[PDB]
């Protein structure tokens, strides 16, 4: 496939960027939508939706299950209930989140519903959810994808002992459908523990906006009663995460990027976000009706942990490669990452390397020396955040071409275009 150049910065970028809906808010909320609408309690609407490749998935795995969704642009309307026919197969495709999300939804069906995905797919882990689910009722078929789950009419729940070290996915999974078990559910997550705890916190929040009732004062464990998943309206907000290779730009350029309807209150670590960026001393600004960061003339070496915003990595592994020439940066707390379908700690070295930088794996994470750039093919393996920090550091650097900007897809269609205009 042809490669996309990635246009440079050589003066100060200046922009205003409206980001497209929240992709972690949009999946909760279609399996949240679900939930309600099979409980009977009528259609939900999501308004702001992600239209995406991996809302996509999500989107269609709900009406392999048997849910009706309806809606062409950023509103989406879920009606209908969980009756897969027979031989039903989901295909999870690049969705991490419909391989983990929709397995407990089939729990709560009648027939068997095949899992399936491509190879990359494949490669992903999932085990400990199988076996949970097995733990707690679910009659399951297989150890890796492709899986069957063996829905019979309901999910008794009680409690399990599951290592969620893998994905918070798992947890997430378990959580939003626990509400519709018999005896709802109680996961216990075991030693240590809960890299990505935004991302079970924006599940518990969501799960509360529904009036489903969940315990969460003691770490690592959880506790979900039985009872209503509340049809409703949600409300998505832009994703925070995407809205920071937008940000990244000012930040590298000394530039000023304004993000539209940055929201006030958050279901998002926002505040992670912007902290990570008063770190570079970037200035943030409360704008009218947007969030303004003004970035700083330069910048040198920073520590910054990642633990809890791993989807950062990229954005900031660019960040640490155009710093002052010689800043030694360290990314820590991303030792998790290193066992994902997508290894982004060895992609990522792997790539600033063969640019001429120099970034290597530390235990934690890694280490990002600042040394010359030189032009080259940034490969995003279809990682869609390793394509926008392609395009991040190409920002600095002349000759630098992502070979596959379609990658964005997975969770922003338009991003060429965005990019686009926002440098130019």
Known sequence: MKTWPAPTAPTPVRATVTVPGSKSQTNRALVLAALAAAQGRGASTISGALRSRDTELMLDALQTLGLRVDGVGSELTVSGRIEPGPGARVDCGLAGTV???????????????????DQQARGRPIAPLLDALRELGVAVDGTGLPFRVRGNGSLAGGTVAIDASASSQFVSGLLLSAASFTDGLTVQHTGSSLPSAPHIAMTAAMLRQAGVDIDDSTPNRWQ?????????????????????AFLSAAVVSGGTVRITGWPRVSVQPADHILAILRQLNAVVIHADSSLEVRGPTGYDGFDVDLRAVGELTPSVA?????????????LSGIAHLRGHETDRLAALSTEINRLGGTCRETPDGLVITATPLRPGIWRAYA????????????????????????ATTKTLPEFPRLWAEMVG
Do not use: K, Q, Y
């Open 318 to 330: 660019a960040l640490a490669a155009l710093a002052s020439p010689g800043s030694v940066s360290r």
């Open 383 to 406: 990682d869609h955040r390793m394509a926008m920090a392609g395009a991040i550091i190409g920002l600095r650097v002349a000759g630098v071409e992502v070979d596959d900007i379609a």
């Open 224 to 244: 979900v009663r039985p009872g209503p998943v509340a049809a409703r309206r949600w409300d998505i907000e832009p994703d925070l995460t995407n809205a920071v």
């Open 99 to 117: 391989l983990r999300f929709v397995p407990p939804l089939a729990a709560l069906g009648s027939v068997p519903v095949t899992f399936d995905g």
